[PDB]
């Protein structure tokens, strides 16, 4: 809450604000890039979906990754990594440890790390992930 009093609601805002944090010696977003479990909200927000799931049945022939939404999400990922907003070799440990120090301002996490941030005593808040191109994230 201290590094950012007003969270953004668009992923398209994340690059620009990152330009601010390098001016303070900070990083905008740092999380585990080594898992699809973290990245699937963004890439599958606007058209990606793991398996087609209807009426309680998962279609096996309908693995959706060759979609324009998955393309858009992965291009946004390569725009966040090409201009060096984040690092590619980062993972969960460095991310959470730096957020406990308060170096990176944003992170994405489930419940299991909440108490860990309660060890940091950083005045923090929790909110929904930003939407992307109007289509909200899909954890």
């Amino acid at each position: 809450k201290d590094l950012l009093p007003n969270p953004p609601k668009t992923w398209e805002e994340i690059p620009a604000l990152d330009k601010e944090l390098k001016a303070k010696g900070k990083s905008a977003l740092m999380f585990n890039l080594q898992e699809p479990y973290f990245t699937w909200p963004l890439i599958a927000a606007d058209g990606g979906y793991a398996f087609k799931y209807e009426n309680g049945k998962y279609d096996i022939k309908d693995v959706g990754v060759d979609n324009a939404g998955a393309k858009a999400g992965l291009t946004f990922l390569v725009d966040l990594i090409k201009n060096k907003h984040m690092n590619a070799d980062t993972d969960y440990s460095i991310a959470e440890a730096a957020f406990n120090k308060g170096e990176t301002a944003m992170t994405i996490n489930g419940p299991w790390a909440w108490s860990n941030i309660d060890t940091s005593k950083v005045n923090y808040g929790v909110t929904v992930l930003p939407t992307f191109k109007g289509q909200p994230s899909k954890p």
């Binding site: 330009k19 390098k22 090409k82 590619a88």
Partner: protein
């Protein structure tokens, strides 16, 4: 790379003392990682000029492309670091380097709204007409993101360069016309003399525009001069009518240039145009219309006596 990652950490962190000691130990400067990121890349991304300076003192590569195509100039133009852009250009950085998207550094600086970077890039010969994979010029990226002064600069520069090329074109048409009229089957000496005079006047017009562009600090950029539409004109009347059509086209482009200069709030350009160009065009159009109506009244082209006597009495 025994000290190469030791250079990568100081490039990420910005310690002039660390890199000074590493150059005292002779650390290698071309330490590429798995994705091509050099110590110069991180030195540019960080924005500390001293590590960049000493890296270039020990011979780091200025045009090292990564797996995405970015050079240090690209990243420097993205993040808006003026001095390192200047010293990269001073050390032979390629100003028209394309990335994977075909986006030059000028595309980036116009997309993000950095004026001084745009101007320093224009000084070193950045291409105004470079298109990316979507067919976007930097002018398009500047209007799409609301950087109106960048778009003004980019539009005025292109318009003056096109007017220079158009004045050079018209001189070559008059050269063609002049040497048509002294062929041994077109024996009209005063027609040829008249059109050689016009050729040299248009050469002077183009040189005046070049001098003006140098006084303002803009960048002259020359293109091909295309060949005239005919090698064979047909008569004195037909060539006079083609010359009238030509000067009307030139006048129309000058009026568009004046309207563009008035939108950009440039009174000096407006006064330059209306003092040296707009009255000469009116005079030339009046004189060429005079010649056309007199030649038509005398009975040309189907009277060979008419063009001979026009040659003697009007052009003589």
């Amino acid at each position: 790379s025994e000290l190469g990652k030791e250079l990568l950490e100081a490039a990420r962190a910005g310690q002039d003392d660390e890199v000074r000691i590493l150059m005292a130990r002779g650390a290698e400067v071309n330490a590429a990682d798995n994705t091509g990121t050099t110590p110069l890349h991180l030195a540019a991304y960080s924005g500390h000029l001293e590590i960049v300076e000493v890296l270039l003192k020990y011979g780091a590569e200025v045009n090292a492309a990564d797996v995405f195509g970015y050079t240090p100039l690209h990243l420097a133009a993205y993040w808006g670091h003026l001095e390192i852009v200047e010293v990269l250009l001073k050390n032979g950085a390629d100003v028209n380097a394309r990335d994977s998207d075909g986006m030059t550094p000028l595309h980036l600086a116009a997309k993000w709204g950095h004026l001084e970077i745009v101007e320093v890039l224009l000084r070193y010969g950045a291409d105004v007409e470079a298109q990316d994979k979507f067919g976007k010029t930097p002018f398009d990226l500047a209007i799409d993101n609301g950087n109106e002064d960048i778009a003004e600069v980019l539009q005025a520069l292109l318009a003056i360069n096109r007017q220079i090329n158009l004045e050079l074109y018209a001189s070559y048409v008059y050269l063609s016309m002049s040497y048509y009229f002294d062929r041994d089957d077109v024996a009209l000496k005063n027609f040829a003399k008249y059109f050689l005079h016009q050729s040299h006047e248009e050469r002077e017009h183009a040189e005046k525009l070049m001098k003006l562009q140098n006084q303002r600090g803009g960048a002259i950029s020359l293109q091909d001069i295309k060949k005239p539409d005919c090698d064979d004109w047909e008569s004195g009347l037909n060539a006079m009518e083609c010359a009238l059509h030509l000067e009307k086209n030139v006048n129309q482009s000058l009026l568009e240039l004046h309207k563009l200069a008035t939108d950009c709030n440039d009174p000096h350009l407006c006064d330059f145009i209306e003092t040296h160009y707009l009255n000469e065009q009116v005079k030339a159009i009046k004189e060429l219309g005079d010649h056309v109506t007199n030649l038509r009244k005398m009975g040309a082209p189907e009277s060979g006596l008419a063009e001979y006597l026009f040659d003697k009495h009007t052009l003589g």
